[model samples]
Target: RRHSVMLDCKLWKDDPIYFFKTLPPYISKYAQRADDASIQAQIDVFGKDDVGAMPGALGPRGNFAAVTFAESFPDRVAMLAYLNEVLSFYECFEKQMTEMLDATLYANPVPKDPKYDNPVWQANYKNTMTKWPKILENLDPKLGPKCVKSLVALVEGTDMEPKMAHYKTMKEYALDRTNYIAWPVACDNAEFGSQLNLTQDQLDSVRDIFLPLWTHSCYVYDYYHYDKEAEIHSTYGKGRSMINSIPLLNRLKGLSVEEAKAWLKQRCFELEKEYLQRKEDYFSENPVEAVPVDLRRWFLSQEDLATGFAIWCATTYHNHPPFGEGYAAPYEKRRKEGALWFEKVTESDQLMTGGFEVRYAN
Candidate 1:
């Protein structure tokens, strides 16, 4: 358990607001990392303080790192949001990478070689096998319509495929946990309502807006991927899954299937056109939007975020990996490919410029 020797409980309530708003760097250092080295690096930053106090602590009772307050909020939004981010991660990109590795094991006729000695290289080589299905189904524009249609069937529960029980059960738990938060906010004297300044009708409205899109959005986000890891897509997609839900969700909201498809076509084509325009705007102006101060609290520079979004688009456009892992290598290898893999697969490549060698072209 982590301890906070310096924390005053009274200060923390206001601090949570400051934490999310300004996102001070030291606090954001802990955004998402479990790595020993990364943890140690952060520890070194805090070494000046002899006491064990951090901005928050993590014990059975709770701490910032533990998100202890989430349990106390009486509203499950914090937990469910975290749950959706975590659980859908495994359901979508994480499991697929495992499937990819399994395919590699089956496909390997000659398992032993100098280069093949390490599982990192094995997984890297194997990542190539993923190219065909991953590309054609998710990234291929010409044939991607079939992919989208199949997704629509799943959303409608019209497919013969078994329902996703594990995720469904977990989803139910999340919803049950937050059922109170769904009630009119006026009834909630709890922190969730007060902190967000939510009202009863407002909570009801947000719930309704999310309900129609939830199932379909979750599935599409899970099944499809960019060349990068799922979390990257989670951040960058910014609601592609919701956008993907247009036709079906449109139907639910009373659009005829014919009208929904027309709307879908308009949206998809419009996004594609916008992508082309954004590409030109970015490359021509090469504008580096100043990274927000709050963003720095999350430990990123404007350039890195710009590059990350740029990479997301270009990789999606090409349906492939980077221009040969030219960026920071050690982190890039794991981040772009192996970070999300099943632990049983192998230790991911740690080479300065390591990762899957084949950049199978579209």
Candidate 2:
């Protein structure tokens, strides 16, 4: 795969931005696979429901197999990260809302909610009942005269499933409902009601920060799934999203930092334009019609909203992980791997499977 595979414990544990920097080349590697073949070939042969048993159906270099396998790897990473992001969002909102509620409402004891502690996928016994025979059939070649004993072992293994189930309940808490709380004040006639103690400015400040974070999260969600099937489903401004620009935004060999920034702007502008339009539409439909005089400040202008969105992308991509010098180590590592199964990028100092491959950029 010409891609250096390293288990950098420090990168994973300490600097998230630096850790994330290691992913772009891998992302580029898969992207190249997806784009190598003709568009129709992708949809017809290796597609989920496509016909099989044809000669050379697997395609050259196991491209079809490689594409599916490659996609599955990153998709899993993104899905796990996105799930963590959702969980984090829930915990943050729950904490802030709980704080306000405790200060204003009943002095109830803090709910010792362990629900947010990392959830895991538990093994299920239901699979063995139907899947056991299929598994045995696939392994018939490997199962020798001791096949019966192997089957017995398999049955025993599946029967005694792992015992690690403690979470008994889950509450679907919505952020919108608990997005606000008593504004840490004793409201006598604060217009909205006794519980509504926040001044407009206070709520506006909160909205300006939290709203864009959620928005950027949505963008990340869509970007991951954009190329799963085909072009029509592309999410970034008809597929002009961040994923396209992120790899290039690295300190590509020929492109200076300024040049990379310019390229990024060019690619992201279309997506940003469409995103802004959709956001404007959302705000228009959900316009601030009538609120307490103390709450009007929460409704910010288009400019300020855009500014908040800029902050959202900055924090999401830049500060999150894998952005700067830490990236160089990983890129160099991939270059040093010298594997042929993966594509190479000249700009990244990784050679092609065929030759020196430094004359061109990936």
Candidate 3:
């Protein structure tokens, strides 16, 4: 068993406020990765209207038009082509940005030049892949390669086309022991709420409810990535992504930066309530236990606890970037192909933050 986790606790909670307050770094890290790639995306499609900017800063979570809208099963081919686009150009831009500021918006080193085709993309891919090896050394060897193989094969045409499971059939993949990143968050607290310190039946109930949702998000996160985590709300495309991009006020000179930021903080929590934070809403057909948990400890829960919980949940359950020994070769392979990124936020973001900082992050 994972000792780090076992020593922690027996029960899980649903506190959005908790999610907000606690998960900021995880959020920021993912946000940084996502934002770098996505700034260009927002610039390309989110429109000239500043309205589409602020709110959650969808960094990595932003739907890359190339990945999301690719018409065919490009799989690894598609993935490669897409990464080539981002990594290829952003290195030069990142260097320029870093030269000016001495740091970048991205948390880790971005891709650079000197490889095949665009040196920037290739180099950054190499640059990013370096971090995964030592992590692989400490992790399950099978798990590391499985992630690499599955990620690439899914795109390449292994032809493993299983239709999305109708909830019940998905448990094995969703809650496998190695899939710890998602299980706790995905579990139904209500079914096992009373049994936190009691029976395993309720505990099992928790896993059944939470693992699926958490794992699904995990799958999306791992497979469709190389961007900042914050951009899911930053770009205005899909369902919720669209809503968060709406204006606080339409006037050109409406709310000042601070006012807009404060308003957005609360508004995002409300949005999280309506959509993301609720266990049931996220898994309606699937259904998780809908109960509240007490969060006297987590800092952000002064008003409501879920805030902190949601932030924590989102942060912890998301990206498990593969690092360390055995992971290096695979990580490098993927990174070279543009399948991985070292920096949480990308250089492209540094390239295009002119709008994001003023519009959102500022």
Candidate 4:
């Protein structure tokens, strides 16, 4: 049987408020509150309408992921909403980072470009650094404080601060990117699994299964916009060339661009095989009947989440620079190309055998 879900951006594009309305009641209530707080924070920092017209600021991806999970397991609606709330805070944090740190700072070092040490940039950077912790303070007292605690630990425990210079290693670049852009997924999975009373081993297994699926799928989809961003020297697309693993691998491993693409394509196949085997091994040992209902739904929903996230990544636009009125044509082209790229990358023997297809709605 083919597994797929209709991922639509129309609601977000036409009417963002209505987008939240479509969520299940349990999720819609908290998501709206959390989203409001994020919007208010943006307004407070950057004035009304100054941040461009991207709905939810930087929220659509996290929102889409939470919605996908809720679609599969309504019983886990509360956990998913909580995830959306936490993700909202991080999304705001990322937006603030993008606003304060320009491409020059992210791309060049203080030595290479004195602007990195420019007093004005330093002042803005220091001011923005203080705003991050405040974002999570608004998190719900009960379901969110623990998540806040864990998110803080993750942020504090890592060298998450951008070097404001060139990265020396792929590990350095990947760690920083993962901490900022990717770790919220991990945070939500662990905390949500914990709240559901999963054992340590079960939590470990859940992380193993979902993190790669989420990150790799996003990386593939995001690659579609890579060329356009590079052409304009966008931060993610060109500043450090950290759009996806391909360029980072090219820089660090000394591989040509084509070589990096081949390596990543092969790695995508390996990841799919690994995911399937891990799913088989885990469920075989701990049969679906024995798994907690929430966990069981989560376990079985991997294909749906993968497909949904793929389509979301393809449909939703990133709220970065080079994305306003004059950029429509190229943006539309990349969006179409990105969706096709996702299909190409995911057309492996494993995904095919699993009957997964990426579908879109409008």
Candidate 5:
């Protein structure tokens, strides 16, 4: 079965560019960086000798299992492989904007580059756009199209200046960003559970927990990384970071940095409590035996999902080099501070139980 899955991954391994070619021009250029060396580096840094021993260690890849609590090792690895591809695509996309765009001009709205206004680029863009859906259909036939469709919707949503610029309140911005990030996770949970022969009610039950869990986890995690990201984006003169909640909070609500942090921390805790109550209610209504035995460990607990996501966010930030050497000082400082903040915020309430420690060095 493992070998069979490997065979399925051949296209991704043989021609990854096909998977990425349909991205926006600014993002598509970064496809070259998603080569074997970079992908392997990500895997090596995140991979554990024994996956089961380290809960939430896999990050997004592990979170798949964390949510279901029943996936085999092979399925987890396959998910990891898929995640790496997507990560590499976006990592480069963010990197390109950081390097190429001027922060002052595009801070609020990132515009299409007139540089790609030529005939050749347009032709290729049209060609690849046509092929993308078909390629996705061929990739998994089960969940690939569904997952990528959610992701693409997120990409298009964030890329639109009019849609993003018009948020009326902090609640509006928070809900939009959180939902954008969590939608893919929700799709995966539902689509993958359906494949597992889970009933519609069970699938809906899984989504009820997953949607909020991922949204709240990503919301807080994004806040935790905001300072470093803001600093880096400002230094690079890349305005892309403005779309994040911290800046939006300041813009829309007129909150100070300290004030924003305090509010974010408080809100994150509140959201966690809400998720816990929901999880508790879910289990109260559905007993252990009511769920399939194979899908029963950890029971998709909030702690496991949140902890895994937090670790993934922290480690990826620590491991990936999104900025240059000159920016290392502030990035390193934030990395330490972020880890401390995660521990501090999560420690008092015992919000996370996956050890929740981020190493100072890779």
Candidate 6:
């Protein structure tokens, strides 16, 4: 069976312009045989992958890539780096948002979002039971063992459950309340109010930088789901709504580097909090919107093999680790064990996020 994976990461300048910037070198430098060794390869190899070629995930506006690859090798470094990079990107975003909570612009905190120190997935059993009492069962093949079991417990195994061949579930939890989650997000994401380890000063900083920006961006999903987060089912728009919040009349616009960075980070936490479902008081009414098909496709493709985000140029295909199963010799020998290259990358490289495999199976 073929595996379908989703690589979850925010696209950075994932546009035609960025594409040209990335692909020219990408093909000539990485996939050298793909086209001529010229910058023309940028537009020539336009829709290389279907991740976000059209108005699919990024909407009718831009391009998106699942960062996917298919090859005879089960899991290669190329695949791993791409996939892992996406995860790290997302992780970095959350960390950044947590720090942004230190901004002063914030007025009230959203009850669900965590602070800067980082929040774990803690289902306050009391709140979970009281608010939701029902977890919707979603059966989509895409979900792993964890997902199926999660949804089954909440549902009655009822006759009325939303059914499809896909293994998926949807239901409510606490923290879906509009009063707590919405108003604070009028200018911020859900991260403004969550469980994270932050000093009093850091908390103050989050409010300063985060609050103003929160109101600036639009709520893609708003407060739709207390559950049903396994897939896409929410509103879509031009990324964020900064039109009126911080309108730029002159050639220059954007928060001072410091303030805007705070904005990015604060929103990331809001996303993390929402996904983790930190709030239980309003679960019955609100739920998580499903992930978009296009976005999911992009995620599915982002399986990293870089052993974690260690930025390096490509190597010969056979030296890649995924082929180790063929022989114990190479398998036992790591790509490069105990070396300065590995050490520096490991130490200096701010980790994005990492998991075991570069590629994933559905």
Per-model CA lDDT versus the true structure: 0.26, 0.26, 0.28, 0.40, 0.40, 0.21
Tens-digit per-residue lDDT, 219-240, candidate 6 = 2122111112211212322222
Using lDDT as the measure, which candidate wins? 4
lDDT, candidate 1, equals: 0.26
**What TM-score fits each model?**
0.21, 0.18, 0.25, 0.51, 0.52, 0.19
Best by TM-score: 5
Q: Please, what are the lDDT tens digits per residue for candidate 3 over residues 1-362?
A: 01101111112234332223222211121222233333333223222222122221221222222211211111221222222223223333455333322332432322332322444433433433332322322333432343333323222221111211222322343333213221221121111111113245533434333333343333323222213323433452222211111121212226653554444446444444433344444346433333323111111111112222233223321222321122233223323444322133234422233322222332
Instruction: Write one digit per residue (lDDT tens) for candidate 1, span 53-100.
Output: 111111111222212112122112222222122212222233333454
lDDT of model 5 at residue 153? 51
State how far residue 332 of model 6 sits from its true place (Å).
32
- How do the candidates rank by TM-score, highest first? 5, 4, 3, 1, 6, 2
* Model 6 bad stretches (over 4 Å): 6-63, 67-255, 278-362
Residue 261 error, candidate 1, Å? 10
Please write out the lDDT profile of model 5 over residues 209-260, one tens digit for every residue.
Answer: 6555556555666665676566656665564445566666777778887787
Location of the lowest summed lDDT over 10 successive residues in candidate 5: 21-30
Candidate with more favorable, higher TM-score: 2 or 5:
5
